[PDB]
Amino acid sequence: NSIQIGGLFPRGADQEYSAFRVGMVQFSTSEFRLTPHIDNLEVANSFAVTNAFCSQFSRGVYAIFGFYDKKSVNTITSFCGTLHVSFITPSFPTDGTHPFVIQMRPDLKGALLSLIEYYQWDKFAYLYDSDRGLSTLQAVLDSAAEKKWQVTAINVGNINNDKKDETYRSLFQDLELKKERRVILDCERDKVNDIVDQVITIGKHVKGYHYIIANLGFTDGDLLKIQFGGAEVSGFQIVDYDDSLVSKFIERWSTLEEKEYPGAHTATIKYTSALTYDAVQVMTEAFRNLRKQRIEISRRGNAGDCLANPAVPWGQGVEIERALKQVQVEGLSGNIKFDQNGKRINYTINIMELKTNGPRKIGYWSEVDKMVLTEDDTSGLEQKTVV
Amino acid sequence: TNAFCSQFSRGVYAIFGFYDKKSVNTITSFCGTLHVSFITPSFPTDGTHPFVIQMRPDLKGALLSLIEYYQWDKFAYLYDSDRGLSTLQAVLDSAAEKKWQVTAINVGNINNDKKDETYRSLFQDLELKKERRVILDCERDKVND
Amino acid sequence: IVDQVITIGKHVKGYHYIIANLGFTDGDLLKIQFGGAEVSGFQIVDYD
Ligand SMILES: *[C@H]1O[C@H](CO)[C@@H](O[C@@H]2O[C@H](CO)[C@@H](O[C@@H]3O[C@H](CO)[C@@H](O)[C@H](O[C@@H]4O[C@H](CO)[C@@H](O)[C@H](O)[C@@H]4O)[C@@H]3O)[C@H](O)[C@H]2NC(C)=O)[C@H](O)[C@H]1NC(C)=O
Known part of the structure; x- marks a missing residue:
């Protein structure tokens, strides 16, 4: 049983693609074996993806695992609603309800909004780039009106890397305009550090x-670099390094030859990569649950050119979507379950504040129970009371 | 994509058409690659894309100054999903500059079954903050609704 | 010492x-040039 799958990896996602292979051998079987035809492409260019899709499609593919961008997502979701090809991604959740998509990434919109109510914030600023959709911004915008908050929403993405020293001082002149001391960083990990390093130098990281x-x-x-500053730093985790399941992973993964699996030698792993490694598991457990039900999926003939006019949806596509979406496996990203639209459901998200001795978990946000804390601390009001 | 390659294989010299917020990323990509020349009256691009002739003049600056003109400081901004969130993010970034208090509410996703109810649900919620200053920014059809 | 100072936040106004x-x-x-704090020193090689 030789199964052909198409891979869409952006330029230099080395840890993801590395984890992609260590999943191949982790969930390797003697029943079948996934044969991945991989395409390295610039995700941003819609033309590049389109021709890579047409490369994969005419080659005959059962499923595609890839990454998209807010520029490309409406090329992928448009060609996956037509040619019924299943798409698995660790990228941001889709703006709406697109079919034949398996978003390995849990919607973060639900968690962040329930976090702000915990700190009892009322006035803050929002920093974002559109790269992971304007969905998360319209969330804090809509919720702002309901219980009256005050949010300074600033677009941070459109700054070139030739003149950026005076676009950050200028930025934080508008953020001293109302004594802004509470800032949200909804950004790419790179833009997070670019912001932080700049924030470090204008010294807006103290108590x-x-x-x-x-x-x-x-x-x-x-x-x-923000550990001894003093300011309060909160974030979200999803790759629990305390869970023994990922702990075994961490033992092996941190000890691989670094030349073989690039940027993978650490005792830690990015969430995009920890989704790819969990994405392989779901695709594997789906193609076992297709032969277990004895249902056949073998492509009758070639698919032909993808621009086929009129286009023919090969029937077994709607079954592969179904099988994928009904899989329930346990991986790095905790619990993996989907619904009729591919959205991650019944998932754990960790809330982690920064402290001196390191990062620390005060609790978790549930998709059903909202923000729920963790008992591991002593009472703060518990001082010396005088008789 | 089909309608484009259809015209491209026909070897036309310049394409005239439209697009949506979703499709525009397809049009622009195939033009900056195949050197295809495109002309459109739909809303201006989200940056500097080559081989594009936007007949629609930039609306942003005109709107921004009109608020600056009327000496507003606290207004409501209903918005549609259509012509991008360009003329919204503009007034939401300038919010801090000239001291504004912007209430932005999405309206481009109302169902036509309860259209008359949701439109009366919004405004009877806008007498909460008693905001009597509203900018619309919509497809002319959604305006009269 | 400078590097240490920046990290702990003793280089602001x-x-x-x-x-x-x-x-x-x-x-x-x-690395502190924009920090808001005032830093004084001495030059012996006048580049002008
Ligand atoms: C939504 O997501 C929930 C969180 O992942 C998920 O939760 C769990 O439910 C399953 C089964 O109900 C739990 O799995 C078990 O753990 C117990 C205790 O360690 C094991 O004994 C058990 O072994 C079972 O043993 C049976 C013996 O006859 C055997 O027949 C069964 O097949 C099975 O092997 C399970 O390993 C899991 O721990 C739960 N997670 C939690 C709360 O920690 C929900 O199922 C999911 N909701 C739905 C309805 O989709």
Whole structure:
């Protein structure tokens, strides 16, 4: 049983693609074996993806695992609603309800909004780039009106890397305009550090300031450079390094030859890569549950050119979508379950604040129970009471 | 994509058409690659894309100054999903500059079954903050609705 | 010491350091140059 799958990896996602292979051998079987035809492409270019899709499609493919961008996502979701090809991605959740998509990434919109109510914030600023959709911004915008908050929403993405020294001082002249001491960082991990390094140098990281890192990869980036500053830094985790399942992974993964599996030698792993390694598991457990049900999926003939006019949807596509979406496996990203639209459901998200001795978990956000804390601390009001 | 390659294989010299917020990333990509020349009256691109002739003049600056004109400081901004969130993010970045208090509410996703109810649900919630200053920014059809 | 200072936040408006040598611009200064704090030193090689 030789199964052909198409791979869409952006330029230099080395840890993801490395984890992609260590999953191939982890979930390797003697029943069948996934034969991946991989395409290295610039994700941003819609033309590049389109021709790579047409390369994969005419070659005959059962499923595609890839990454998209806010520029490309409406090329992938448009060609996957037509040619019924299943798409697995660790990228941001789709803006709406697109079919034949398996978003390995849990919607973060739900967690962040329930976090702000915990700190009892009322006035803050929002920093974001559109790279992971304007969905998360319209979330804090809509919720702002309901219980009256005050949010300074600033687009941070469109700054070139030739003149950026005076676009950050200018930025934080508008953020002293209302004594802004509470800032949300909903950005790419790179833009997070570019912001932080700049914030370090204008010294807005002492006691009084409070940051929220709105991505599923908190301990992914650098945090030591804001470890002794004093300011409060909050973020989200999803790759629990205390869970024994990932702990075994961490034992092996941190000890691989670094030349073989690039940027994988650490005792830590990015959430995008920890989704890819969990994405392989779901694709494997789906193609076992297709032969277990004895249902056949073998492509009758070639698919032909993808621009086929009129286009023919090969029937077994709607079954592969079904099988994929009904899989329930346990991986790095905790629990993996989907619904009729590919959205991750019944998932754990960790809330992690920064402290002196390191990062620390005060609790978790549930998709059903909202923000629920963890009992491991002593009472703070518990001082010396005088008789 | 099909309609483009259809015209491209026909070897036309310049394409005239439209697009949506979703499709524009396809049009622009195939033009900056195949050197295809495109002309459109739909909303201006989100940057500097080559081989594109936007007949629609940049609307942003005109709107921004009109608020600056009327000496507003606290207004409501209903918005549609259509012509991008360009003329919204503009007034939401300038919010801090000239001291504004912007209430932005999405309206481009109302169902036509309860259209008359949701439109009366919004405004009877806008007498909460009693905001009597509203900018619309919509497809002319959604305006009269 | 400078590197250590930046990390702990003792280089904002409210602090003042005096670099006691003949080569102020000889070292690195850009890592606190925007910090708001005032830093003084001494130059012995006038580039002008
Ligand atoms: C939504 O997501 C929930 C969180 O992942 C998920 O939760 C769990 O439910 C399953 C089964 O109900 C739990 O699995 C078990 O753990 C117990 C205790 O360690 C084991 O004994 C058990 O072994 C079972 O043993 C049976 C013996 O006859 C055997 O027949 C069964 O097949 C099975 O092997 C399971 O290993 C899991 O731990 C739960 N997670 C939690 C809360 O920690 C929900 O299922 C999911 N909701 C739905 C309805 O989709």
